[PDB]
Each structure stands twice: as C-alpha cells, then as structure tokens.
Ligand binder design. Structure first.
Ligand code: NAG
Ligand code: NAG
Ligand code: NAG
Lengths: 437, 101, 51
C-alpha cells in the first residue's frame, strides 16, 4: 500500500498514522524524526591567522647601491636608505664615511601556532536535509536515513520512503561563513586577493602549508634614526585579532529554530522549521486481513480530568465488548488530540485506559478503537504549570482553540443580530406587501 | 539571542513562548523550556473569565473578536429598529393623513 | 579644535572646508589638507545637474 502524510520536522514527538485499506485491518504507523542534518555544500576561499611579520637582517653596501629585487614572498617590502652609518657592538660596521645604502626587507609569514588558531572562510550555496526516521508499523521497526528532496527513496531495503519537498527553506548560514576552532560565524569576509589591512582577511592562503601566501598588512619602513642597527617598521594591527575581539556571538548561540551548529562537516542539526510530506510504500506482508483482527461490537469512551498541555495530559477509559482476544491498534482521528499508545490489547467485556495530549479547551474528538469510531466529548482545564520542559506535540488551530462555551456565546450574539436582521427584513417585506396591494 | 556576562547575584527575566526558549548558563548544558497556555481564567465559565483568559493568551485577537461582536450587535439592533420604524411609518401614514378614520 | 586620545584601530571623520584642516597624530609633524569644490553634478550641462 501507498500512504502519503505530512509530518512536523520536530526531533522527537512521534507522529500518528492509521493506514486503512479496503479489506484489511487498520494498521498503526509511528513516524518519528530522531535526527536532522542541514548539510550545505561548502568550498573554501582561504585560511587566515595571526601573522608573524618576520624582518630579516638588513643588507648594507658601502659606497655602493642596493636597488632591491622583487620577490614573491607575502607582502614584500624592500626599501633603500641613503646616508646610513651601520653600528653594531664593537664599532662602526663599514668603511664608507657617509654614502652608504641600506636595503631594508620586510615580508610577512604565518605564526608558528597558526595550525590550531586559524579561521577558514567558506561559501554556502544551498543546504539539503538528511533526516533519520524511526517508522514502526505492525510491531516492526525501521530506522532509516532519507534526503528531504522528493526523489531520494532513502534506505529502502524493505520499506520505501520518499520525503517530499519541505514547505520552507531555512538555510541558517548566509553566503559567507567563517569557521574558527569549531565556532561558526556569518561574516562578510573579503574575496581572494581583495585584501584590506587592519581587518579580517588581511592575510590569505589556500592552505596552512601552502607557499602562495598573499597579504596587505600596510607595513611601512622608516628611516633609522639612532646610530645602532635596527629596521624600524610600523604596521597595522592583525585583522585576525581585531575580528577575534569583535566577533559577536557565533551561530551556536544565535541560530534560529534551535539549530545546533556542528563542524567537520559544517551542518545544522536537530531543529524544526517546517513540514515534510512523507510517502511510504508499506509492504503487503505487514497488513493482515480484517477477519484476523478482533472486531468490536460495542464501545464507549469517557475522559477523566483532561488538562490540555504539551505533556500527555489526558486519560480516557474505553469500555468495550469484543469477540476474541488479540492486540489491535487505537488511533485519535483529530489533529488536535494525539494518543500516547498506538497498539492496545483487547480481549473481552473490559476497559482500557489511554493518555492523550490536546491543544483545545474541549476534548471533542473521534477515537478509533481497532476499527470502531467513538466521539469523546468533554471539557479540558488550563494547566496550573506555566513552563514545561518538553515541546508541544500539537499545533494550535483556531476552530479547536475556542471552547464550546465561548463558541456558544459568540454564535448566540451573532444569531441574535442576524435574527433581528431577518425579522426586520420580514416586517419590511410585509409592509411593502401591504402598501403594494 | 541575548548574551550577558553576569557577576554577583541577580534576577533575569526572559519571555518564553510556545516556540520555546533555550538558555545556557556558564559551562552547563543548555536548558530548553516551553511555555504552555496557563492564563488566569476558565475557558468554560462566565463570559468575563473566558474574555480575560483569551486576552491573556492572545490580546489582539480577543479584542478584535470582541469589537467585531459589539459592532455586529450594534448594527443588528440599529438596522432592525430602522426596519421597525420604516414599517411603522408605512403602516401609519395612510391613517395619519385622515384624522377621521 | 578636536582633541581625542585614541587606542586601537578606528576610523574618525573630520569636516574640512576651503579654509583647510591641520591635524597632528601623536609625535608626527602636522599635516595640512585642503578641500576643493568637487561636488556631483555639472555646472555646464542640463539644468537639473547644475541645480
Ligand atoms: C578589544 O579588546 C579590549 C580589551 O580590553 C576591550 O576593552 C575592547 O572593548 C575590545 N573592542 C574594541 C572594539 O576595542
Ligand atoms: C520579572 O517578572 C516578574 C513576574 O513574575 C515580576 O514580578 C518582576 O518584577 C520582573 N523583574 C524585573 C527585573 O523586571
Ligand atoms: C564617515 O563618513 C563616511 C562617508 O561615506 C560614512 O560612510 C561613515 O559612516 C562615516 N563615519 C563616521 C564614524 O561618522
């Protein structure tokens, strides 16, 4: 058989289904989302870290020039100094009295500890769900992973399950994402080569061990003043450090819908943001004929102390008469009330208690015990506990959320207004008939 | 998302809805709480209790429903009285043009 | 005259007219800048541009 039904994307909160073939016993179907994974396609632009800005020993020539040669090192800066007099300890370091050339060199390099404290820049294009479904039917379980796209049938070894397209596409990550030590940020990092000093992305490379490092650190070489040797350089601060100091909060603390952000691979796990239409091809071996199931002759339900809440705050007792002992399921036919137990055991002339969770002030819903439908109808009280630790199992509907007393007063006022309108038009028509004759 | 560095002893208020609220306090694991509708009233009772219960649940929906039903009853009574007045006019007009009738 | 002690990397805006603006940043010699009347539009073109 083929059955298509829509499930919320909530981790936990099993979803009730009663598949009902024409000549077969009704069969229970629990559809539970045990896991979810929004895993997007990420490619990396570069990696950045705090730089090292190593300055080598300056080159000196005495009564001779040192026009510097261009090099391929990161943020190379070679600059020539005239009228210098080098002086280390032990005396003046060369012969030439005043016409000396000093080639000062300054390039930049990764710090030795960049293999740990590094930020990797990625693009995020689109993300597709990969949900784990626990589906149980006819006392048979099946845990299987499916892609929520409408075509992939998942792990269809025995049970063929297609998760149709979800109603809304969330994608918590923006286009450009920075990952640093397991923390994920939506930062608008610069492109490869469009580098800005004093900001994030000032130094870029394709890999930590890569050799083609590019940087714009705004390094400036100054003419030396003291007699001793040194290379005076003024440089903008590390944009990695500035971004660390002004990172804001990562997406593990600000992602909507409660999406737990995890890394290697980048993904968002265990969050609900829509509805999945799942179509299931249940095999015919799971079903049984209606003659093998114990039919019900008389059955009546009475609810006791209904409290509408996220927890199972219901207790209904069904009194039944059955032909023969056997186990055969039970279901709640309203979207407002969902049962707790799916399959019950029915023997003869007895009573079974069941728990339900509802979101309506009135419990007025149909319970199918093993094929027979009954209307359970009474009033539910608001809870005394204000805050609960489990999510709501049923979404609220406008028709259900208004009680019988409130609807009675509303239609009482509306019917009074409409009845005065009708009798006014009636007496107007009577007056028109009297004056027309 | 609200992040705050707290020292000493204080009290922090957080509005929890039906969608829920997840809070992390220090190195502890996150705690998730869901607000369930527990308005101070009774949906099965006198109209004022129902009104205050639904107003505490949804204020704008309750006030627009109350305004709508008030407008409905005012229009119904006003138009019904207008029809009664028009019928009285059309009935008593022939007898008002003759004192001797 | 605007005087401010500044720590860390930050950007500061300053208004200069035709008269000029002289700024001193720490222990450097003062630097003078002068503004010129380069505004968007065209004094020789369509009327809305010159307005
Ligand atoms: C940078 O870090 C310092 C460290 O004391 C802190 O005071 C400051 O608020 C941070 N942010 C900026 C923008 O300077
Ligand atoms: C927090 O809310 C409670 C309501 O229970 C109120 O009594 C209290 O004054 C509020 N505290 C603050 C600091 O707003
Ligand atoms: C300075 O002026 C520029 C002009 O585009 C503007 O974008 C920027 O926000 C201004 N900054 C401050 C701190 O006023």
């Amino acid at each position: 058989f083929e059955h298509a039904t829509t499930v919320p994307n909530v981790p936990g909160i099993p979803y009730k289904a009663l598949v009902e073939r024409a000549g077969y016993a009704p069969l229970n179907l629990e559809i539970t989302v045990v896991s979810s994974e929004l895993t997007p396609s990420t490619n990396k632009e570069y990696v950045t870290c705090k730089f090292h800005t190593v300055v080598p020993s300056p080159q000196v020539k005495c009564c001779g020039s040192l026009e510097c040669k261009a090099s391929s090192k990161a943020d190379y800066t070679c600059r020539v100094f005239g009228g210098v007099y080098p002086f280390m300890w032990g005396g003046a370091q060369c012969f030439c009295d005043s016409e000396n050339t000093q080639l000062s060199e300054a390039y930049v390099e990764f710090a030795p500890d960049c293999t740990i404290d590094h930020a990797v820049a990625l693009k995020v294009h689109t993300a597709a769900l990969k949900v784990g479904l626990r589906i149980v039917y006819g006392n048979t379980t099946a845990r299987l992973d499916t892609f929520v796209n409408g075509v992939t049938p998942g792990s269809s070894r025995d049970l063929k399950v297609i998760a149709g397209p979800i109603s809304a596409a969330f994608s918590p990550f923006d286009h450009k994402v920075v990952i640093r030590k397991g923390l994920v940020y939506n930062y608008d990092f610069p492109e490869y080569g469009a580098m800005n000093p004093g900001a994030f992305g000032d130094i870029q490379a394709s890999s930590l061990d890569a050799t083609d490092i590019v940087a714009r650190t705004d390094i400036r070489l100054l003419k030396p003043s003291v007699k001793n040797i040194h290379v005076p350089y003024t440089q903008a601060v590390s944009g990695y450090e500035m971004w660390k100091n002004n990172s804001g909060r990562p997406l593990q603390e600000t992602a909507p819908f409660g999406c737990k952000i995890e890394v290697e691979p980048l993904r968002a796990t265990n969050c609900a943001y829509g509805h999945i239409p799942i179509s299931i091809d249940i095999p015919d071996a799971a079903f049984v004929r209606s003659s093998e199931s114990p039919t019900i002759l008389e059955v009546s339900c009475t609810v006791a102390d209904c409290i509408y809440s996220a927890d199972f705050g219901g207790s209904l007792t069904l009194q039944y008469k059955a032909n023969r002992e056997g186990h055969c399921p039970v279901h709640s036919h309203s979207t407002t009330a969902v049962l707790k137990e799916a399959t019950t055991h029915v023997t003869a002339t007895g009573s079974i208690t069941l728990h339900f969770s509802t979101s309506s002030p009135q419990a007025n819903f149909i319970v199918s015990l093993c094929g027979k439908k009954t209307t359970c109808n009474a009033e539910c009280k608001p809870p005394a506990d204000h805050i609960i630790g489990e999510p709501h199992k049923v979404d609220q509907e406008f028709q259900a959320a208004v009680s019988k007393t409130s609807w009675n007063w509303l239609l009482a006022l509306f019917g009074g207004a409409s009845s005065l309108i009708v009798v006014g038009l009636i007496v107007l028509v009577c007056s028109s008939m009297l004056i027309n004759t | 998302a609200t992040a705050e560095w707290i020292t000493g002893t204080t009290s922090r208020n957080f509005s929890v809805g039906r969608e829920g609220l997840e809070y992390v306090w220090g190195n502890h694991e996150p705690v998730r709480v869901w607000a369930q509708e527990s308005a101070p009233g009774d949906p099965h009772g006198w109209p004022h209790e129902i009104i205050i219960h639904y107003y505490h649940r949804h204020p704008v929906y309750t006030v627009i429903v109350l305004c709508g039903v008030a407008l409905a009853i005012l229009v119904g009574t006003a138009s019904s009285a207008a029809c009664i007045a028009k019928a009285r006019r059309d009935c008593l007009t022939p007898y008002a043009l003759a004192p001797n009738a």
